[PDB]
Design a protein around this ligand. Structure first.
Ligand SMILES: NNC(=O)[C@H](Cc1ccccc1)c1nn[nH]n1
Ligand SMILES: [Cl-]
Ligand code: NA
Ligand code: NI
Ligand SMILES: [Zn+2]
Length: 330
């Protein structure tokens, strides 16, 4: 078996290999990339997402989110307090202000130490889940607005036509903005391009070991676990690498820089943080190998994990026994 230790793999496709997206995902899996839960893809030197980022300041962040933490430095939850709308230009200025700017640091490891030591004592503001794309329409390779849709994948594999659409989202980050431990909706894949700005550090648990993370999370967040049998779906819980190591949880870490793609694989739990002002674009996608994961994906039915209406059809078709209860939750 390829990649038995479940290491994060890094790929350098040539321009020819960058033409057929599906084929390259399958190639990465043939090399065992999915065992880690996360892979990095460095685009060929000839490729670009768009010509410049000089004209993005008028994009609106309609509902910036202030990420307020509770708990201890290595084991905490965060809630999202809505703030007033601001443009990307205003957000960038805020990110670079003395209150929010990245501190002096020696290297990525120093900054990571500072993040886990100090994150809870600050409440950074995040632009998340903004429907849109920054790929030029003329970028033909790895354009996250032009991928095959999940609905078409389900139709091709299973023969059923379903409603729904699947479009990309933009994320504007600043120092300490945080993504909590989660898998994707219906344990889909995700792909993420860091268009501009400072890095993003990722943590990931191999899919084969996801239930180890779930068990630790139930121990560390006991009230949340009692409230919902799939509370990680709420996307609010953080556990540091130190705490994971103390509890023997298998995981890996990597830092993504501007111009790089990351793919998360079905049932690969991930979390992470932004180093400073940045902009990423992401979308969920499926392949034939996802279908078995979608059929088995846990679900939140307690009401907290509200999701797009395009998830209705996935639950309805792949998980008919669970559909009525999940629907009540929505
Ligand atoms: N599935 N979504 C996520 O992993 C995002 C983080 C994320 C956003 C862009 C590129 C890579 C990762 C998230 N989740 N909660 N806040 N942000
Ligand atoms: Cl700090
Ligand atoms: Na490892
Ligand atoms: Ni994700
Ligand atoms: Zn729930």
């Amino acid at each position: 078996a390829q990649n038995p230790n479940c290491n994060i793999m890094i790929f350098h496709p040539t321009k020819e290999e960058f033409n057929d997206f599906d084929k390259y995902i399958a190639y990465m899996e043939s090399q065992g990339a999915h065992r880690a839960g996360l892979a990095k893809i460095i685009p060929p030197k000839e490729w670009k997402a768009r010509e410049t980022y000089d004209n993005i300041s008028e994009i609106l962040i309609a509902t910036p989110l202030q990420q307020v933490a509770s708990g201890r430095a290595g084991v905490f939850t965060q809630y999202h307090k809505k703030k007033k709308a601001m443009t990307v230009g205003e957000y960038r200025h805020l990110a670079n202000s003395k209150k929010y700017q990245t501190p002096p640091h020696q290297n990525f490891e120093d900054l990571e130490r500072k993040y886990w030591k100090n994150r809870i004592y600050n409440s950074p503001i995040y632009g998340a889940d903004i429907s849109g794309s920054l790929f030029d329409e003329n970028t033909k390779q790895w354009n996250l607005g032009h991928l095959g849709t999940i609905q078409d994948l389900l139709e091709k594999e299973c023969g059923v036509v379903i409603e729904g659409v699947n479009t990309p989202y933009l994320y504007f980050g600043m120092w300490k903005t945080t993504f909590a431990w989660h898998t994707e909706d219906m344990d889909l894949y995700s792909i993420n391009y860091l268009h501009l700005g400072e890095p993003k550090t990722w943590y990931v648990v191999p899919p084969e070991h996801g239930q180890r993370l779930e068990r630790l999370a139930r121990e560390l967040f006991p009230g949340s676990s009692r409230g919902c049998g799939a509370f990680l779906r709420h996307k609010v819980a953080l556990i540091s690498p130190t705490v994971l190591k103390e509890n023997g949880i298998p995981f890996n870490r990597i830092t993504q820089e501007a111009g790089e793609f990351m793919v998360t694989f079905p049932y690969g739990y991930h979390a992470g943080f932004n180093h400073g002002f940045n902009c990423a674009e992401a979308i969920n996608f499926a392949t034939p190998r996802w279908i078995d994961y979608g059929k088995m994906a846990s679900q939140c039915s307690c009401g907290e994990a509200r999701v797009t209406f395009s998830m209705d059809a996935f639950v309805r078709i792949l998980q008919p026994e669970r559909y009525d209860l999940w629907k009540r939750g929505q």
